[PDB]
Design a protein around this motif. Structure first.
Motif, short mmCIF file in Angstrom:
data_model
loop_
_atom_site.label_atom_id
_atom_site.label_comp_id
_atom_site.label_asym_id
_atom_site.label_seq_id
_atom_site.Cartn_x
_atom_site.Cartn_y
_atom_site.Cartn_z
N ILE A 44 0.82 -1.20 0.00
CA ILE A 44 0.00 0.00 0.00
C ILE A 44 0.86 1.26 0.00
CG2 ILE A 44 -1.71 1.33 1.32
CD1 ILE A 44 -2.88 -0.93 -0.24
N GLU A 47 2.40 1.67 -3.19
CA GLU A 47 1.37 2.04 -4.16
C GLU A 47 1.07 3.54 -4.05
OE1 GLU A 47 -1.89 -0.73 -4.15
OE2 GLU A 47 -3.09 0.46 -5.55
N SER A 51 1.64 6.43 -6.94
CA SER A 51 0.45 7.22 -7.20
C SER A 51 0.82 8.69 -7.40
CB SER A 51 -0.53 7.08 -6.02
OG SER A 51 -1.80 7.61 -6.33
N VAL B 163 -5.34 5.75 -11.29
CA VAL B 163 -5.68 6.43 -10.05
C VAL B 163 -6.99 5.86 -9.51
CG1 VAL B 163 -6.15 8.64 -8.92
CG2 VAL B 163 -4.59 8.54 -10.89
N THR B 166 -6.31 2.54 -7.87
CA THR B 166 -5.56 2.84 -6.66
C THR B 166 -6.50 3.31 -5.56
OG1 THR B 166 -3.59 3.47 -7.92
CG2 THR B 166 -3.75 4.29 -5.66
N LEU B 167 -7.49 4.13 -5.94
CA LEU B 167 -8.47 4.64 -4.99
C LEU B 167 -9.30 3.51 -4.40
CD1 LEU B 167 -9.79 7.89 -6.76
CD2 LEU B 167 -8.39 7.75 -4.70
N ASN B 169 -8.35 0.40 -4.19
CA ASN B 169 -7.41 -0.38 -3.41
C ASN B 169 -7.24 0.26 -2.02
OD1 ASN B 169 -5.24 -1.08 -6.32
ND2 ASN B 169 -7.23 -1.90 -5.69
#
Lengths: 212, 213
Positions: A44, A47, A51, B163, B166-167, B169
């Motif tokens: 995470i 990640e 991001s 994105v 990812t959000l 996740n």
């Protein structure tokens, strides 16, 4: 009688042993649950870092699409100035022909040949002016389209603002989360050790009582 | 002899109690952070979900943006069609101007003036031809830009797509993490209460011993 109070100590020793034993079991079990998610947490954090690069690229890409729209806006401005020049040429050509036809009529039969040619050049001049306004109409459509694009891009930049801020709040929370967990483990390990040390001493002392 | 042992227990118990008390103090402080973090987590989950719908809107908008570039593409193509029409007209006016000088040149001295106007019309036609060439050059550069912007939007659309994942996740992690937090809190809650009862029991019994025998 004295052997009577001996059972009291041994009994108390048992109580300690059972308390520390439970403590060890509880904390180790707690520690295991914390640890079990330590791996999921690394992915995470990694990640969230990648991001940030995606965010940074998007911010620039939106910037790039805007300057590009600004490029065709410039080119349209140029095309418009150019098409206006063609329009002026058409008008200048038109009155030259019109005045040409007039004088052609002044002279006799020979002027007829020139008159007909001058009449056609006029029609052609008017046709050029006609196509010119059609291009202006198109150029104006592109201006309208381009304006709607710039606004759409601002709308996107506006909405993405929250997205960037949210990922940042996530990174922070993750640091604080990791930190809280470390402290939890730290308090557990530290307390289990010192307490287990205490029951160990209470146990030995007890062994002494019965021993002799 | 029961004394050396009794004094040993009293001392050890005392220290033992100090330790338990210490764990309870620190335990209380950690629980206060856990509870606050559970609330922070709640807000971040709401932020994550809002960013999700925001990204969804953006996905739809880049599609719209793509339609707008394509429409400029159609129009700029319509302009090239129109420009060609003007180019044919300018050619057609040039030969007319050409057959004009000739006819004037055959008329005699009286045609001198009619020659001048025809020469200018030629030049004017040639002028239109050049301006048109500049317009073609600009019209192509817009296409060049439009396609370039279309590729930028394409890579943008898929960037918003990363994105967005990812959000989701992050939402998944926070939901999980909140459970871990609740679990640690509950674990601490119960253990504190039991450790307190059990430690109090031993404390009392130690005091009962210290006073007798």
């Amino acid at each position: 009688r004295i052997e009577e109070v001996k059972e009291r100590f041994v009994n108390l020793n048992r109580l300690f042993q059972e308390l520390v034993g439970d403590f060890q079991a509880k904390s180790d079990q707690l520690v295991s649950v914390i640890q079990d998610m330590e791996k999921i947490s690394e992915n995470i954090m990694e990640e969230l870092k990648k991001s940030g690069t995606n965010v940074d690229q998007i911010v620039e890409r939106v910037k790039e699409a805007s300057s590009q729209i600004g490029e065709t806006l410039e080119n349209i401005r140029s095309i418009e100035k150019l098409i206006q020049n063609i329009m002026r040429i058409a008008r200048e050509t038109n009155i030259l022909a019109l005045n040409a036809t007039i004088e052609a009529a002044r002279a006799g039969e020979a002027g007829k040949g020139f008159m007909i040619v001058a009449n056609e050049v006029q029609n052609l001049s008017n046709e050029t002016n006609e196509v010119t306004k059609q291009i202006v109409e198109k150029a104006r459509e592109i201006l309208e389209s381009s304006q709607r694009s710039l606004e759409n891009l601002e709308f996107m930049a506006n909405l993405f603002e929250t997205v960037g801020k949210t990922l940042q709040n996530m990174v922070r929370f993750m640091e604080n989360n990791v930190k809280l967990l470390q402290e939890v483990r730290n308090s557990l390990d530290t307390s289990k050790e010192s307490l287990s040390e205490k029951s160990a001493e209470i146990d030995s002392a007890t062994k002494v009582l019965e021993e002799t």
